[PDB]
């Protein structure tokens, strides 16, 4: 049977027909590891990122787009972030990227920050609940977004399979954090253009709409000084 | 001429100035994806120096791209003069619809480039995700021939690198395993027997 074929007669995407402990202590030991959860409001615009420290194991940068809202960045603000100089030596960047401009436009600044692409996890939304409208250039109805995983230094699949939100709603899937947890890359975990609701434990969150704050760079080191500097965030905690 | 053509050749020493204009480019390279080479692989620069800008004034490519080349087609698809504007990703199930490095990958990538200013094609029927069943290796799925048909009916496509069961209405399949040449349009038939008298390329 041909999906393709499926859709143009019904509205129903192609993906809304794919189907379908033993990892289980894994996210047991991911919690135990997790530091208490940090966030900080700040106008990333205009906020120097240098103040961010330590250096982060994995960075997480959901930058709002346009094409999210069918105040908004362009690929052009994005690019000249200094991220750069606030990544570990070797440290991963998971890279929210829509799906226009910014699949190669993304690419342009994880090769700018000094990261190699290892990853394209695509977020595929369903329309299970509602058999849209056009960019110019879109030669295709386009059903999913990007997520580009950058590596910089020495059980999962790259898909998310979601019913497309309500129009208007900008969240991202929470499985991308479960992805992201579960390759155990370290414990200082940065959210850049998080929201009050994606704060989480073990997660460092920065944005501009954040109702509160409770950020402190000299309480942030503290859950990372020795013993505990090189932990991969799937082990146990040293006594 | 709307029934299969083909040619068995070598994309690097084919002239295929010789084949005219196309709606739609098609192409699965053999990147090079430093990885061991089950086929015989191009390099970078045979990529690049690839003679795609030829093919088409107005229209679309179609390339398809996995582990670095996902970086490279976009060099070479900028090269030779397209800017991307799509991207298809094909989700490979079994018979019962269950999907099939860092992560382990379920899907295969296919950007679409344009070129020109195309006109009268039907932008939006189709949606940028496939849901088909794998079948042999290598092999892409029928569905994108159903997607491109649709988007520009009735035009000329061209393919790249096809193997034999790839040759379908309206298209010429370039691949150097398919058997021998086939060709039925006589504009191309003519300027074939023009640059290739003797009968070999
Ligand atoms: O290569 C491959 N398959 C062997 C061929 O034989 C096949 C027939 C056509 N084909 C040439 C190759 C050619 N030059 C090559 C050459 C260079 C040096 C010495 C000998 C040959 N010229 C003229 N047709 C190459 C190949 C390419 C891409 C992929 C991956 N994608 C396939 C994918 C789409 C969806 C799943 C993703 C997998 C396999």
Same mark, same amino acid.
């Given at each position: 049977?041909?999906?393709?074929?499926?859709?143009?007669?019904?509205?129903?995407?192609?993906?809304?027909?794919?189907?379908?402990?033993?990892?289980?202590?894994?996210?047991?030991?991911?919690?135990?590891?997790?530091?208490?959860? $940090?966030?900080?409001?700040?106008?990333?615009?205009?906020?120097?990122?240098?103040?961010?420290?330590?250096?982060?194991?994995?960075?997480? !940068?959901?930058?709002?787009?346009?094409?999210?809202?069918?105040?908004?960045?362009?690929?052009?603000?994005?690019?000249?972030?200094?991220?750069?100089?606030?990544?570990?030596?070797?440290?991963?960047?998971?890279?929210?990227? *829509?799906?226009?401009?910014? @699949?190669?436009?993304?690419?342009?600044?994880?090769?700018?920050? *000094?990261?190699?692409?290892?990853?394209?996890?695509?977020?595929?939304?369903?329309?299970?609940?509602?058999?849209?409208?056009?960019?110019?250039?879109? +030669?295709?109805?386009?059903?999913?977004?990007?997520?580009?995983?950058?590596?910089?230094?020495?059980?999962?699949?790259? !898909?998310?399979?979601?019913?497309?939100?309500?129009?208007?709603?900008?969240?991202?899937?929470?499985?991308?954090?479960?992805?992201?947890?579960?390759?155990? %890359?370290?414990?200082?975990?940065?959210?850049?253009? *998080?929201?009050?609701?994606?704060?989480?434990?073990?997660?460092?969150?920065?944005?501009?709409?954040?109702?509160?704050?409770?950020?402190?760079?000299?309480?942030?080191?503290?859950?990372?000084?020795?013993?505990?500097?090189? %932990?991969?965030?799937?082990?146990?905690?040293?006594? | 001429?709307?029934?299969?053509?083909?040619?068995?050749?070598?994309?690097?020493?084919?002239? +295929?100035?010789?084949?005219?204009?196309?709606?739609?480019?098609?192409?699965?390279?053999?990147?090079?994806?430093?990885?061991?080479?089950?086929?015989?692989?191009?390099?970078?620069?045979? $990529?690049?120096? @690839? /003679?795609?800008?030829?093919?088409?004034?107005?229209?679309? !490519?179609?390339?398809?791209?996995?582990? =670095?080349? $996902?970086?490279?087609?976009?060099?070479?698809?900028?090269?030779?003069?397209?800017?991307?504007?799509?991207?298809?990703?094909?989700?490979?199930? /079994?018979?019962?619809?269950?999907?099939?490095?860092?992560?382990?990958?379920?899907?295969?990538?296919?950007?679409? *480039?344009?070129?020109?200013?195309?006109?009268?094609?039907?932008?939006?029927?189709?949606?940028?995700?496939?849901?088909?069943?794998? =079948?042999?290796?290598?092999?892409?799925?029928?569905?994108?021939?159903?997607?491109?048909? =649709? !988007?520009?009916?009735?035009?000329?496509?061209?393919?790249?690198?096809?193997?034999?069961?790839?040759?379908?209405? /309206?298209?010429?399949?370039?691949? /150097?395993? @398919?058997?021998?040449?086939?060709?039925?349009?006589?504009?191309?038939?003519?300027?074939?027997?023009? =640059?290739?008298?003797?009968?070999?390329?």
């Amino acid at each position: 049977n041909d999906y393709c074929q499926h859709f143009v007669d019904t509205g129903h995407r192609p993906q809304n027909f794919i189907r379908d402990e033993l990892i289980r202590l894994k996210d047991e030991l991911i919690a135990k590891s997790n530091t208490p959860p $940090m966030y900080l409001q700040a106008d990333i615009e205009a906020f120097d990122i240098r103040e961010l420290t330590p250096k982060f194991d994995v960075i997480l !940068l959901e930058p709002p787009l346009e094409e999210y809202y069918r105040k908004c960045w362009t690929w052009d603000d994005i690019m000249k972030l200094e991220i750069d100089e606030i990544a570990a030596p070797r440290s991963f960047i998971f890279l929210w990227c *829509g799906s226009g401009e910014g @699949l190669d436009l993304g690419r342009v600044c994880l090769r700018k920050w *000094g990261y190699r692409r290892c990853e394209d996890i695509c977020w595929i939304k369903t329309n299970k609940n509602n058999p849209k409208t056009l960019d110019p250039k879109a +030669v295709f109805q386009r059903t999913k977004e990007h997520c580009l995983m950058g590596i910089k230094g020495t059980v999962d699949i790259d !898909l998310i399979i979601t019913e497309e939100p309500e129009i208007g709603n900008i969240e991202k899937p929470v499985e991308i954090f479960h992805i992201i947890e579960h390759f155990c %890359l370290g414990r200082r975990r940065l959210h850049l253009f *998080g929201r009050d609701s994606t704060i989480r434990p073990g997660w460092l969150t920065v944005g501009p709409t954040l109702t509160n704050s409770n950020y402190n760079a000299e309480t942030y080191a503290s859950y990372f000084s020795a013993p505990n500097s090189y %932990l991969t965030g799937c082990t146990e905690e040293i006594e | 001429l709307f029934p299969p053509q083909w040619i068995c050749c070598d994309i690097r020493y084919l002239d +295929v100035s010789i084949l005219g204009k196309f709606a739609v480019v098609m192409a699965d390279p053999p990147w090079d994806i430093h990885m061991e080479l089950p086929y015989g692989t191009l390099t970078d620069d045979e $990529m690049r120096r @690839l /003679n795609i800008p030829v093919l088409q004034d107005d229209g679309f !490519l179609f390339l398809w791209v996995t582990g =670095r080349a $996902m970086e490279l087609g976009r060099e070479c698809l900028n090269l030779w003069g397209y800017e991307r504007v799509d991207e298809i990703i094909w989700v490979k199930t /079994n018979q019962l619809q269950r999907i099939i490095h860092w992560l382990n990958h379920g899907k295969e990538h296919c950007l679409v *480039g344009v070129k020109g200013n195309p006109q009268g094609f039907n932008q939006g029927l189709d949606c940028d995700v496939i849901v088909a069943e794998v =079948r042999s290796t290598s092999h892409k799925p029928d569905e994108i021939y159903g997607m491109i048909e =649709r !988007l520009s009916p009735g035009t000329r496509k061209i393919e790249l690198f096809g193997r034999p069961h790839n040759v379908q209405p /309206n298209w010429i399949t370039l691949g /150097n395993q @398919l058997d021998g040449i086939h060709l039925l349009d006589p504009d191309v038939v003519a300027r074939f027997k023009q =640059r290739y008298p003797d009968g070999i390329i």
